[PDB]
Ligand binder design. Structure first.
Ligand SMILES: [Mg+2]
Ligand SMILES: [Mg+2]
Ligand SMILES: [Mg+2]
Ligand SMILES: [Mg+2]
Ligand SMILES: [Mg+2]
Ligand SMILES: [Mg+2]
Ligand SMILES: [Mg+2]
Ligand SMILES: [Mg+2]
Ligand SMILES: [Mg+2]
Ligand SMILES: [Mg+2]
Ligand SMILES: [Mg+2]
Ligand SMILES: [Mg+2]
Ligand SMILES: [Mg+2]
Ligand SMILES: [Mg+2]
Ligand SMILES: [Mg+2]
Ligand SMILES: [Mg+2]
Ligand SMILES: [Mg+2]
Ligand SMILES: [Mg+2]
Ligand SMILES: [Mg+2]
Ligand SMILES: [Mg+2]
Ligand SMILES: [Mg+2]
Ligand SMILES: [Mg+2]
Ligand SMILES: [Mg+2]
Ligand SMILES: [Mg+2]
Ligand SMILES: [Mg+2]
Ligand SMILES: [Mg+2]
Ligand SMILES: [Mg+2]
Ligand SMILES: [Mg+2]
Ligand SMILES: [Mg+2]
Ligand SMILES: [Mg+2]
Ligand SMILES: [Mg+2]
Ligand SMILES: [Mg+2]
Ligand SMILES: [Mg+2]
Ligand SMILES: [Mg+2]
Ligand SMILES: [Mg+2]
Ligand SMILES: [Mg+2]
Ligand SMILES: [Mg+2]
Ligand SMILES: [Mg+2]
Ligand SMILES: [Mg+2]
Ligand SMILES: [Mg+2]
Ligand SMILES: [Mg+2]
Ligand SMILES: [Mg+2]
Ligand SMILES: [Mg+2]
Ligand SMILES: [Mg+2]
Ligand SMILES: [Mg+2]
Ligand SMILES: [Mg+2]
Lengths: 129, 149, 141
RNA sequence: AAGACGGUCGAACUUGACUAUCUAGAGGAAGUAAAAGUCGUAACAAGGUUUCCGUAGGUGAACCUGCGGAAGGAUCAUUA
RNA sequence: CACGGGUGACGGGGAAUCAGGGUUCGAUUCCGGAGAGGGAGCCUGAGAAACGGCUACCACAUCCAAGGAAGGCAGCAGGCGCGCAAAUUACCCACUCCCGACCCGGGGAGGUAGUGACGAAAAAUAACAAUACAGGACUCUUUCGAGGCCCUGUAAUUGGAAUGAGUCCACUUUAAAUCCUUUAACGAGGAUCCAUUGGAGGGCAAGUCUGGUGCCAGCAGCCGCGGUAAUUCCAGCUCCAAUAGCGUAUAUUAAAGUUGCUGCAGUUAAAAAGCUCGUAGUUGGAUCUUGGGAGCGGCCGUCCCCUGCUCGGCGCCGGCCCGAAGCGUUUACUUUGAAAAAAUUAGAGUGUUCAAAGCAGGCCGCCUGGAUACCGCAGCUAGGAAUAAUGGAAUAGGACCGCGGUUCUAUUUUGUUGGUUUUCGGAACUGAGGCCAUGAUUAAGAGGGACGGCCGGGGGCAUUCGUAUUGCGCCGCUAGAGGUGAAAUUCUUGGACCGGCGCAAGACGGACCAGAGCGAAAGCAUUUGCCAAGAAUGUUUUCAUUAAUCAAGAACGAAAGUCGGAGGUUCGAAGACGAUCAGAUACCGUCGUAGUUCCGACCAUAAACGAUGCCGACUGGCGAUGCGGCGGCGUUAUUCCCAUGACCCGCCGGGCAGCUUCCGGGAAACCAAAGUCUUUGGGUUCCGGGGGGAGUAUGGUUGCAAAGCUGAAACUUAAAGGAAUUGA
RNA sequence: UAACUUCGGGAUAAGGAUUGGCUCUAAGGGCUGGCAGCCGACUUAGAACUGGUGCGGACCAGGGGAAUCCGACUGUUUAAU
């Protein structure tokens, strides 16, 4: 059955970006998905999106640019200290100039570079570049 | 897919976005639930109380006209059946299969389905014991299940 | 990995143990069956007494008589076949004397054209066999 | 002080039982490896009876046959 | 994952290897445990179940006058033994400490030397000049040849200079010595004061040199060399590698993404259980606090606020501001703090002559060092509140807000003694209230259940029909009929085969029948009836997470086979005979037993196959087909038009497949999945680790048996194998 | 308490210990009006002491184990070899 909605959302975006489409429909919606794309939004990887409100788990239509190479999810959500963060980004990012690890902290869902900027560990969610 | 079948069916009811009440419906909440009351005394599970209300009386969803749902109305009054209806209909079916299987021992398919049906009884029974609508010692006995229909 | 839960460390760990026993090199080092089958008992060298001097045929493509010696170990009494390595060195080995034997190169596996020998002679009568070949030392009489 | 009844801890010996390793054995039956051995030709082509799986019987030996499968077949097809 | 067993198991601080992860080792100097040949029992003592204390027994062993006595090196040396495998029966309490009545005595603790290629650091075996030459940039020069201002190398050519290896006066060192350091005198020409260990076919740096051997001797980790021109053996010459070191054997680490958490594989190379159910285990849909303002800066970036209910101090006028104490869903997570032995590792300083080290040192008495980081997990502490768990009020037995009492009861209170009730307080029990916006998220392209019309060789029971086959009865006419490649066995004037009419028996269900359907799979096909079940579709019905995959366990599981009965037409293991053949215990032919059929019980295996786990999401088209539903021109029935049937044109949802494709993947064949994988993480189960031995031995368990399930090792071997290509 | 097994047996398998006398203790029930009174009958377990180690003191009262052959077994048979 469906087990991790964020895993389905990012796999769906990655297939449609890989085939060159312009919009994607994300079938289930949640606060974690909406908060994850707003992180990808702030760095210019995707365009602006829109969540459709049926009285159930809503849908999302996301405008795509041509800038996304891969978005992914890490399962399970491991916990990561500030000591482990350099090793995680050594494994699953292309280079040291671009690419981001999104990881939820008590301060909120937010990517790795500035998660280090306010000195908080967290739980790893995924990556994009 | 189905729990005890390989089919993957998608047919289901689709509830409309507007959860208001239509203007052409004139029944108010109080006389709808007395309409529900007298249908319970005719002898009817909540499943078909709501069926004969949305095709002859026009109430699309009882939970939209009132604030409550049908089975919640009944036990708030005292007319709820003793054991839940979905568990009741499994026991009723497993009794029929068990009786038919008893008269001809060579019905292997009947024996296979009876395993499946009595499996669904136990899966559902321990759910109702976690939500505490059955006593914690309630058990399904194949011999005595005939008495309670 | 196939199972990827946070609370599946017992599953993953206890599956390594089972599947490590199908590794051939792991299987023999961590069982006592291989160690007790070793004539040396797990040592690198062993000394024994010469029983007789024998020569074996080599193998299908080759054709030569491999000069060997049948030696009986001291710590066990087990009888093995060792190979007097170099050219003509078999003369220096006589019956009823003490020799030092070592493995022949491949950890208990047969090597080259000699069929079924795991051992080699390095010293006879407490004087190095390579020194006798080079003429640097002579047999202690 | 020696010594003595009793109690307690209890070595040790005798016997028995269980258990682990190692080892002898007439004869029997395998496996591997050498080889210009004897008898056939079973598998490779439609390998000259297409091959293979399961099961049962039989035969110097490879094998043969009966029943039900498979194509990894030698047919992706055969006409109102 | 108890209990039992094994450990070539004393635990730890640590060691080796290492990208990131890990793997292996820790007898070994520091901490902790245990033991003194094996057990057991005690005395003294603060402290012992002590053994350089005692008493027994067992083993071993010493002296003896034969009566008795004595013993415990896993302390320092040393010896035997075992072994592949490990040092002197040396000097001293001078240093470090410890013991005693003690400044004074003692210490095989410990220190110092001897052996010491375990291993680690430094570092000689030549340097330079001149001639002869050879090259190079230069010039002249057509080159050649020559000028050397400029080199660069080489040459058992010549030449003077510089040293330490060594011998050794002394000093220093030291408890006394030794070593190092300092320093006199000797001490280098083939500076013989002489560098080795492995290789030269490939991997892998480096001779097709010469002599010998002739598949012999030998070499070779692997591939392989060697049979009269050996680049590989044995030698000489030359060359290569490392260099006071190098080779070989063994354990182990990396290489090994060949144990895969990071991170492998399961169509055909080794591999997914026959099928479903199923408990532990693992994993689980959405859903509840946004936002606003102060301040600074270039719409933008940083600082701040959005829990309350006894004691004092910014104090002011019983109230207000703050500080302190107690109280307040629980965790996981994250950041901080404390607490964490040194030694080792990382690391700061410092010219041990550098370095490995060491904790020292520097300046003309003074000045300073002896840092710091890391130390998982578990326990403690303080902030954060995203993510993930978890609880509240639904027979209200719920919050609050005060009033009505009962009981027990702290204690204030009647100037000082005494008895009672108050009130004031505390705790518990009990009435009537008001008040809350009074209290139940939604209704998953999750699931369960209900309901409606259908659908299907799905299942069981009974029933019915059909020819055909074999046999039998009668009738007709006849000499052959059957079989094969050809024949024979076989039947035949006692009438076979053939034609006709009947009867009986047991099987079987053609053609229709399809890359159609139903079922969990195995499987399911004459008619009719009965009984129970099911998918999909339709649904503005109901419950509201009840779910997914699943060790152990359970139901079904073709054919064959086993056991009881009944029946036995055909076919037909075994067997028999006739052929063929070199043989023919076969293929071909005739006969034919068990079986093939049914009922009731076992067995649990198949190429039980799609050689392809299940659940979920996403990613191209096109024409079909089956079921259900929806809509539309028009034909055709009923007829009497509505509506249902049969065609036709589309749309939707499940299903069996098909064609095409640079989606993408793959070693490829090929696959719309076998894709969404080095851009590697959706959940979960089973399962492979070169080929054999071998699904074998043994043990256990199931079965009447046949056999099923679980399941090694010794030993052997450089390949076995998959897809495709060219030949034959 | 073994091999084996037709899972019923083998089996009292095999092999060990105890046993007297005396003096006590505890447990095991009725009837009448979680209590009280009045009645009882035999057993089992445990303890102390004690005897020239003696105790199922007479009587009664299975020797056992490992294999082979035959007949499955219970049963019957040549009154007088
Ligand atoms: Mg399931
Ligand atoms: Mg052949
Ligand atoms: Mg043939
Ligand atoms: Mg053939
Ligand atoms: Mg074939
Ligand atoms: Mg045969
Ligand atoms: Mg030990
Ligand atoms: Mg240790
Ligand atoms: Mg001790
Ligand atoms: Mg000793
Ligand atoms: Mg002692
Ligand atoms: Mg001693
Ligand atoms: Mg001592
Ligand atoms: Mg040594
Ligand atoms: Mg001293
Ligand atoms: Mg002194
Ligand atoms: Mg010492
Ligand atoms: Mg020298
Ligand atoms: Mg050579
Ligand atoms: Mg080489
Ligand atoms: Mg080379
Ligand atoms: Mg070589
Ligand atoms: Mg390794
Ligand atoms: Mg690696
Ligand atoms: Mg592999
Ligand atoms: Mg395979
Ligand atoms: Mg399968
Ligand atoms: Mg969730
Ligand atoms: Mg430390
Ligand atoms: Mg038909
Ligand atoms: Mg199972
Ligand atoms: Mg069958
Ligand atoms: Mg049968
Ligand atoms: Mg039968
Ligand atoms: Mg014949
Ligand atoms: Mg026949
Ligand atoms: Mg199988
Ligand atoms: Mg398979
Ligand atoms: Mg992967
Ligand atoms: Mg293997
Ligand atoms: Mg070879
Ligand atoms: Mg194969
Ligand atoms: Mg017996
Ligand atoms: Mg016999
Ligand atoms: Mg008898
Ligand atoms: Mg008689």
């Amino acid at each position: 059955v469906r087990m991790n909605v964020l895993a389905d959302a990012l796999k769906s975006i990655n297939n449609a970006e890989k085939r060159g489409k312009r919009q994607v429909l994300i079938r289930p919606c949640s606060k974690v998905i909406v908060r994850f794309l707003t992180v990808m939004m702030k760095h210019g990887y995707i365009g602006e999106f829109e969540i459709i409100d049926d009285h159930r788990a809503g849908k999302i239509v996301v405008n795509l640019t041509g800038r996304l190479n891969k978005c992914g999810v890490i399962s399970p959500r491991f916990d990561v200290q500030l000591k482990d963060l350099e090793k995680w980004q050594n494994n699953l990012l292309p280079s040291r100039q671009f690419g981001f690890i999104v990881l939820t902290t008590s301060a909120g869902i937010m990517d790795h570079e500035e998660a280090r900027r306010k000195h908080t560990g967290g739980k790893i969610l995924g990556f994009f570049f | 897919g189905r729990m005890h079948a390989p089919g993957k069916g998608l047919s289901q009811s689709a509830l409309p976005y507007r959860r208001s009440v239509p203007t052409w419906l004139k029944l108010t909440s109080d006389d709808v639930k007395e309409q529900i009351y007298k249908l319970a005394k005719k002898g009817l599970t909540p499943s078909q109380i709501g069926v004969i209300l949305r095709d002859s009386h026009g109430v699309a969803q009882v939970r939209f006209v009132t604030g409550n749902k049908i089975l919640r109305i009944l036990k708030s009054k005292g007319l709820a059946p003793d054991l839940p209806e979905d568990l009741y209909h499994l026991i009723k079916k497993a009794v029929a299969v068990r009786k038919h299987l008893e008269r001809n021992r060579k019905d292997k398919d009947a024996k296979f389905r009876l395993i499946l049906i009595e499996s669904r009884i136990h899966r559902l029974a321990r759910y109702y014991k976690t939500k505490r609508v059955l006593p914690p010692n309630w058990k399904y006995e194949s011999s005595t299940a005939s008495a309670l229909v | 990995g196939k199972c990827r839960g946070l609370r599946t460390a017992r599953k993953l760990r206890s599956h390594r143990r089972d599947q490590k026993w199908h590794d051939k090199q792991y299987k023999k080092a961590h069982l006592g069956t291989a160690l007790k089958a070793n004539p040396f008992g797990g040592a690198s060298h062993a000394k024994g007494i010469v029983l007789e001097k024998v020569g074996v045929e080599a193998k299908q493509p080759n054709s030569a008589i491999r000069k060997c010696v049948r030696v009986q170990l001291i710590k066990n009494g087990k009888k093995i076949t060792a190979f007097v390595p170099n050219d003509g060195c078999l003369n220096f080995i006589e019956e009823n004397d003490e020799v030092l034997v070592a493995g022949f190169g491949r950890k208990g596996h047969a090597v080259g054209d000699i069929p079924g020998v795991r051992f080699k002679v390095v010293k006879v009568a407490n004087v190095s066999l390579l020194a006798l070949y080079k003429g640097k030392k002579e047999r202690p009489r």
